[PDB]
Amino acid sequence: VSPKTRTSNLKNGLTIASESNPLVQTATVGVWIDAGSRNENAYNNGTAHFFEHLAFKGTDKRSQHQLELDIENMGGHLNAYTSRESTVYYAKSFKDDVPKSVEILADILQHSKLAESAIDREREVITRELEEVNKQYEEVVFDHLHATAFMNQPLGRTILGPRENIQTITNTELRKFITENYTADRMVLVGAGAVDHDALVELAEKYFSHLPSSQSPVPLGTPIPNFVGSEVRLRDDTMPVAHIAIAVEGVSWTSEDYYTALVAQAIIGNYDRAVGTSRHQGSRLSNIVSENNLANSFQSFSTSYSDTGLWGIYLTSENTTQIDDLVHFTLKEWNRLSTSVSNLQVERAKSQLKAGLLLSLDGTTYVAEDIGRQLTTLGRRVTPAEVEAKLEAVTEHDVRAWAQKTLYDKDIALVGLGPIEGLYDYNRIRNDMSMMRW
Amino acid sequence: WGGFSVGNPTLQRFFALHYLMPFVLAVFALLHLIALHTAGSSNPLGITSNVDKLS
Numbered sequence: 462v463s464p465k466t467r468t469s470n471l472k473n474g475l476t477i478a479s480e481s482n483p484l485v486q487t488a489t490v491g492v493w494i495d496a497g498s499r500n501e502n503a504y505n506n507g508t509a510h511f512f513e514h515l516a517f518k519g520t521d522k523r524s525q526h527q528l529e530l531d532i533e534n535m536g537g538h539l540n541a542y543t544s545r546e547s548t549v550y551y552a553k554s555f556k557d558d559v560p561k562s563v564e565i566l567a568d569i570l571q572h573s574k575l576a577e578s579a580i581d582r583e584r585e586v587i588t589r590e591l592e593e594v595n596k597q598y599e600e601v602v603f604d605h606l607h608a609t610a611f612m613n614q615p616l617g618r619t620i621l622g623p624r625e626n627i628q629t630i631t632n633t634e635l636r637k638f639i640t641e642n643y644t645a646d647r648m649v650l651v652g653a654g655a656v657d658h659d660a661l662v663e664l665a666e667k668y669f670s671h672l673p674s675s676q677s678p679v680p681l682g683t684p685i686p687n688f689v690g691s692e693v694r695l696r697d698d699t700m701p702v703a704h705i706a707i708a709v710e711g712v713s714w715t716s717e718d719y720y721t722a723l724v725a726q727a728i729i730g731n732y733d734r735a736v737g738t739s740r741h742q743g744s745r746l747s748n749i750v751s752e753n754n755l756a757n758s759f760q761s762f763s764t765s766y767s768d769t770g771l772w773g774i775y776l777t778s779e780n781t782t783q784i785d786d787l788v789h790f791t792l793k794e795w796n797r798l799s800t801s802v803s804n805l806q807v808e809r810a811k812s813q814l815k816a817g818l819l820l821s822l823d824g825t826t827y828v829a830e831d832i833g834r835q836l837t838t839l840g841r842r843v844t845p846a847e848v849e850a851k852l853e854a855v856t857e858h859d860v861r862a863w864a865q866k867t868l869y870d871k872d873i874a875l876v877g878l879g880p881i882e883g884l885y886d887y888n889r890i891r892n893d894m895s896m897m898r899w
Numbered sequence: 900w901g902g903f904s905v906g907n908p909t910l911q912r913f914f915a916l917h918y919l920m921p922f923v924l925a926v927f928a929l930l931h932l933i934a935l936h937t938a939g940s941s942n943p944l945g946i947t948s949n950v951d952k953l954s
């Protein structure tokens with residue numbers, strides 16, 4: 462039984478949340494913000510990601526070089542990432558270097574220069590990033606997947622933004638973005654590892670007390686997405702591996718079906734020919750795929766947002782003449798979540814998940830990421846006892862009912878990249894979303 | 900004719916052959932499809948369709 466997550470607020474409405482571990486000697490402190498690319502419009506799309514670059518380009522006190530030196534002298538590192546709904550800025554350090562790291566984070570968030578010279582310099586760096594994501598096939602597939610599933614909607618936009626915006630982003634719009642979005646009621650200061658909660662609250666009172674509050678404070682993790690059944694094909698005969706994602710509209714963080722969708726996802730599970738144990742997994746799809754050499758890997762996913770989600774599978778295969786079989790067998794395993802699953806699969810998946818949700822948190826950065834994610838999506842850290850109860854409440858009837866309303870005979874978003882000549886047209890893929898025998 | 904003019908022998912043999920010939924015709928219809936299967940259907944533009952096929 463893990464130590465209790467302590468939570469305090471400041472007057473502005475900044476949440477401080479901590480989980481101490483007296484067995485480690487490092488600490489991860491950082492700021493989780495309930496804001497990301499989705500908060501941009503079409504004209505300033507790319508701003509949030511642009512700011513992330515400039516946050517490390519110098520503040521009103523420390524220059525770019527001084528910033529570098531200060532962190533080098535601390536001994537640990539700083540890291541940041543911007544997603545569609547969430548931005549994170551954290552610092553991993555030694556136990557007693559925590560006050561330094563909180564001070565640096567407070568500086569780069571509140572007091573960043575955003576100097577025209579630096580805007581202009583990064584504008585090329587970010588332009589080069591547009592032509593090099595092209596290599597990260599999983600990311601290419603998932604970005605096209607969001608773009609098509611949420612066609613012409615904010616969740617459909619990329620994080621980098623269009624080339625056009627990169628050339629026209631000004632310090633004015635950068636400043637406007639972080640003034641509107643980086644408000645105290647949207648921010649959580651998180652500490653995990655060798656942190657004292659009371660010490661962290663004091664550091665918050667010292668550095669984050671002059672943060673603006675938003676005019677209308679909504680609760681943390683407050684949001685209408687209209688999913689489009691659709692396909693993007695990026696055929697490239699020169700690539701040896703096909704990458705395919707298939708998804709349906711999934712569940713939000715606060716859906717009542719959140720755990721049901723996780724259990725369903727665990728019934729299909731993951732597979733990777735490179736891992737020794739994968740040929741012995743219990744999942745039916747795993748057995749079909751491994752026996753017939755249909756794929757190098759597959760990974761089931763259930764991505765959530767504040768008001769929607771995507772539930773589906775990502776496949777990679779070199780078997781270019783049997784892509785049809787791979788997709789066919791995958792979707793017939795999904796059909797069985799509607800028609801055939803019983804207590805046998807459901808209780809097996811529950812067993813696997815009860816551990817999986819706890820195992821994931823195996824270092825201070827993972828713990829901080831868990832506290833930060835849960836605080837910015839649900840408004841609270843959910844105790845493992847509550848999570849164990851919600852998983853236990855999932856029955857086979859719940860899984861069947863969920864799959865019959867979410868998967869069965871529903872539109873999919875489909876992205877294929879690589880040698881995908883063998884991937885059939887939309888109708889034949891979508892026809893596998895039901896079974897004529899049932 | 901089976902005789903010196905069209906008559907009963909002719910009619911009976913035409914019945915037997917008329918019954919047969921549609922089966923022969925079905926076999927040749929199958930043969931021309933199997934022969935076609937090597938190139939596939941042509942299309943109204945007269946170009947290859949190997950670039951863009953539909954089930």
Ligand code: HEM
Nearest residue numbers: 924925927928929931932934935936938939940941942943
């Ligand atoms: C019982 C008579 C016949 C049947 C049932 C039949 C059936 C078919 C079918 C199903 C096809 C493929 C689909 C299509 O293109 O329409 C086809 C293609 C073809 N048939 Fe016939 N056929 C018959 C008689 C003939 C005759 C008399 C000729 C030529 C004198 C012919 C020459 C062809 C050719 C060249 C094609 C390929 C056309 C193409 O797709 O470019 N067939 N036939």
